[PDB]
Amino acid sequence: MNPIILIIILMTVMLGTIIVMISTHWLLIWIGFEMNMLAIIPIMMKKHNPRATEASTKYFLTQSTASMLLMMAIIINLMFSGQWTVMKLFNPMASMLMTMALAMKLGMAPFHFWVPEVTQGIPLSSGLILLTWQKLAPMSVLYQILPSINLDLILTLSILSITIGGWGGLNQTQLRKIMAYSSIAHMGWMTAVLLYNPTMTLLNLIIYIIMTSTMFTLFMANSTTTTLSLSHTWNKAPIMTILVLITLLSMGGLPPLSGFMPKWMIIQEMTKNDSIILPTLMAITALLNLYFYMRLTYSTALTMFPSTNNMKMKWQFPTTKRMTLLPTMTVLSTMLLPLTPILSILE
Amino acid sequence: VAAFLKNVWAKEPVLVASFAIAGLAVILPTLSPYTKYSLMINRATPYNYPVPLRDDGNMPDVPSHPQDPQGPSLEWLKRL
């Protein structure tokens, strides 16, 4: 791809999400989602192989279906309210359709079935964009419509995403599917706290984006898309194994790390609202996520897998890859828990 | 700036005419003295009913009848 065309297309992805974040009219929300999907299709077809075309076709079909359901929810809102303000919806059917549409755009279970396929089909940088930047616009729409979101629907989606994303990553050896099921479980955690305190939704979103960007940046820096190619990293770059160790222990939510910060605050907001069974079962279900994170830490940092002879050639060459913000992201994804009360800046 | 223009006029006169007509479309309404009259004629066209005002007692510029002297006039449009 032409680098100028790449810059214009990435600015258009950003512009679509920004239009979603700044607009007061529902048509401009829908336009921001259309602009974002249209611009992100070439980022997925960047390398021109049949797996990327299949991933882009599956992504197109799910996001287009969600976009039509979103427009039907907008149109039903216009029936029962005569207006277009991005605020609470004025019909429970429109609220259900918009919550379904946003759950499809997020890839929350049981609309999760595209996220491991599309994440596996595309390069690591475009899957980084898919799992971090593409969550931002539907979460902002969920933020603004929460006075009309049905509680049982959003909590069903939340627990179903956490359980399905926990069990889905246990069977995986591909790193992109591991990050995709990890994404599904973390979005379940974000929507579970949404009607109680959406500031903790924003906190979980930001910490998830930092940790996921860290893991994708490590995978890009080591050119690893499988568990077994990530297991060669100790014989090539031993600092990278320490970084994937601390970041995966943080994504499991183990204190004293920063990824313990969201779920703890989420439990802290769900028990104030007298929900005790639900954050309990959510936290116990997240042990599945920690189990396959620990599987990756065993294969990468805590043991030394056998290498190959040709690795000795790669000892003679330094990493020329721009590992953009990787030390900053690695520090923020691990050492941020003593600054947990900084979350009030999200209020 | 002069050999280039003659070169592109010899090779591609369709594109030279296209960019010339488009440039005259862009810059000439800012240079026309009659662009103001377009706005004046559009705002002088009465699509709606001129809903009258309650005479509170002190409105010297608002007429009491259409044939009164005060009020907006269209002599500029009859004359031009």
Partner: protein, 97 residues
Amino acid sequence: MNLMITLLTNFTLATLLVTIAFWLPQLNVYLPFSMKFFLVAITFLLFDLEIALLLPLPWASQTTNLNTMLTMALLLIFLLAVSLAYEWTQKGLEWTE
């Protein structure tokens, strides 16, 4: 109403003439895919959407916001021209130019 009658009359005359032409002589016994055509059809579709944006201009010239209207009209025709210029320079208009 007169329009529905006229459409029904034209459709009835056309169906009657087709029924004659398929059943009057019954009395006697007696590809590989081309990317280029798809690209010109999609270029038609995109410029046709741009035309759909341009179609309310004879009504849009009647506004009292003429500086804004003229700016946006010239900007839409300019973006249609930039679409054509990008289609030109990236060899999209080639072998069916």
